[PDB]
Structure formats: structure tokens, C-alpha cells
Design a protein around this ligand. Structure first.
Ligand SMILES: [Cl-]
Length: 287
């Protein structure tokens, strides 16, 4: 039986990674190139739509449209759950991880308190895993998962202390079906990581609900994707595994029918899956 709808939302503050970014990695990396920062590259790049790491709006942009809310999207492609980014060269210019996004959001408020009616949307952790795998991190995956969860809990705590009262926390996605993960033969590594994050994060959300009357909503992105992938024709999808827009080892021409594809590139969903995700997220809220 469904629960009561949550209250209407008119402002979203989003924090997170390339599954949310609607233009911040592009703005920041253009700034970094203009200032000659060492190692800087223009992100996301020329096979991506309007600064999104996809071919269309991300899930949180669709959530905002569905709810009739304005969106301040702080998320930055590459962001980890702590201070920094999968792209190490950014750290000398700006701390763009979740913790850095929170720092900057609170610093840009003038000592002014947070809007207690705004929805604080948090969606991060993938790059903690991608960085670990791609650069041979030595931490066991269960400890990495613990670190990601502690970082997320810390961000909620810091935002709540500053005055936030409404949150939407997104689970780990199904990293085990990400094309780069599959091509790297890292599926069971991804399963162990994502299951540890997703088991532990709801327990931390229970603890945080004990003060400030925090509304801490959980979006289980794994449940969402498993349902879509088990019933793809219902949603107009056909190709669940191959990227529409290959980039590795080099860029190839995009597929003709991108709304029938789950993945845009080797890491990111297409606009069609972001739409379905945003609609699923929005279903918990009144208009
Ligand atoms: Cl562009």
C-alpha cells in the first residue's frame, strides 16, 4: 500500500556527480582552461548534450520539471563523496566532491540560513568506486563502501545543521551493469561495493531522522533499474548493454535510435532512462 505523498517542492538544491550535473563540470573546466590550470580538459566533451554527461537532461532535472520546482544543480561530473573529484587535477583549483559542494553552498549563503522547505537532493558514490578501480586503490571494497556512506551521512548532517529539513538521498546505482564495469570484468567487485553502500545507507538515514524532524527520503535506484531492465519493452527500451555513443577505446558514430538505449556512453544512462528515473523520483511528491 502506498504512503502519503510528501509536500510540494518549489526549490531543489542538488549535490552529486555526472548522474546529476547539468552544466557545472562544463562551467568549471572552461574556467580552469581559461586560467591555464595544469591538466585541465574540457568536460564532459563533444559527444555530450549541453554540458550533461548524457544526450539529455539528468534525472534531477526531470524531477524538478515534474514537481514544478526551480533547480540549483551543484553536482559536478567526477565528484566523489568526500572533498575531491575522480579528476585529480581539479583539486588545486576547487574541491568539487560532495563535501566541497556543501562547503561552497554554505559559503555562498552569507551566514544566511538554508531554506527549510527546499529539497536537498544527494546522489553520489559512483566515482568513489570508479577511482578505486581505475587507479588501483588498496582499501578493501567493504571499507570503501563504509567511507562513502560516512561521507554521505556527514553531508546530510552538515546540511541539516545549517537549516536543511528535506532531503532525497539516492542509493548507489547498479554499477554492476555499467558498460565500463562489464568491459573491465569488474561486475562482482561492483556488486559487493554497491550492496554494502545500499545496505548501510538506510541505517544511517534512520539515525539522522531522530532530530530536526528531518524528512529523509530514500530513492532505491537499484530497484528502479532492475524493474526497468526486467521489463524493457514496457518502457520502449531494446538495447540494455551497448552504449549508444561509444567512446572507448575511441569515439564512434552514435546509434540511430537513442531512446531505445539504456546507456549513452560507457558510464551514463541516456536521456530516456534519466526521464524514467526522474519520473519515479517525482512520484513520491505532491505537485
Ligand atoms: Cl555544449
Amino acid at each position: 500500500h502506498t504512503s502519503p505523498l510528501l509536500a510540494p517542492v518549489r526549490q531543489i538544491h542538488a549535490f552529486g556527480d555526472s548522474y546529476s550535473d547539468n552544466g557545472e563540470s562544463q562551467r568549471l573546466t572552461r574556467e580552469m582552461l581559461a586560467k591555464g590550470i595544469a591538466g585541465a580538459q574540457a568536460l564532459p566533451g563533444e559527444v555530450y548534450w549541453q554540458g550533461r554527461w548524457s544526450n539529455g537532461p539528468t534525472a534531477v532535472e526531470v524531477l524538478a520539471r515534474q514537481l514544478g520546482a526551480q533547480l540549483a544543480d551543484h553536482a559536478v561530473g567526477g565528484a566523489k563523496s568526500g572533498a575531491d573529484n575522480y579528476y585529480g587535477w581539479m583539486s588545486a583549483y576547487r574541491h568539487t566532491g560532495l563535501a566541497g559542494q556543501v562547503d561552497a553552498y554554505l559559503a555562498t549563503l552569507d551566514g544566511k540560513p538554508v531554506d527549510g522547505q527546499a529539497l536537498h537532493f544527494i546522489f553520489v558514490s559512483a566515482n568513489d568506486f570508479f577511482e578505486h578501480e581505475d587507479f588501483a586503490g588498496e582499501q578493501p571494497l567493504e571499507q570503501l563502501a563504509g567511507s562513502s556512506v560516512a561521507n554521505i551521512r556527514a553531508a546530510v548532517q552538515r546540511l541539516g545543521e545549517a537549516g536543511a529539513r528535506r532531503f532525497l538521498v539516492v542509493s548507489s546505482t547498479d554499477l554492476s551493469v555499467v558498460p565500463a564495469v562489464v568491459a573491465g570484468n569488474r561486475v562482482e567487485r561492483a556488486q559487493r561495493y554497491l550492496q554494502a553502500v545500499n545496505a548501510s545507507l538506510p541505517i544511517q538515514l534512520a539515525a539522522l531522522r531522530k532530530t530536526r524532524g528531518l524528512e529523509l527520503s530514500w530513492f532505491d535506484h537499484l530497484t528502479f533499474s532492475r524493474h526497468l531492465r526486467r521489463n524493457p519493452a514496457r518502457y520502449g527500451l531494446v538495447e540494455l548493454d551497448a552504449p549508444c555513443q561509444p567512446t572507448q577505446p575511441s569515439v564512434r558514430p552514435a546509434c540511430a535510435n537513442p531512446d531505445q538505449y539504456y546507456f549513452w556512453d560507457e558510464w551514463h544512462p541516456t536521456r530516456r532512462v534519466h526521464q524514467l528515473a526522474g519520473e519515479a523520483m517525482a512520484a513520491r511528491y505532491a505537485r
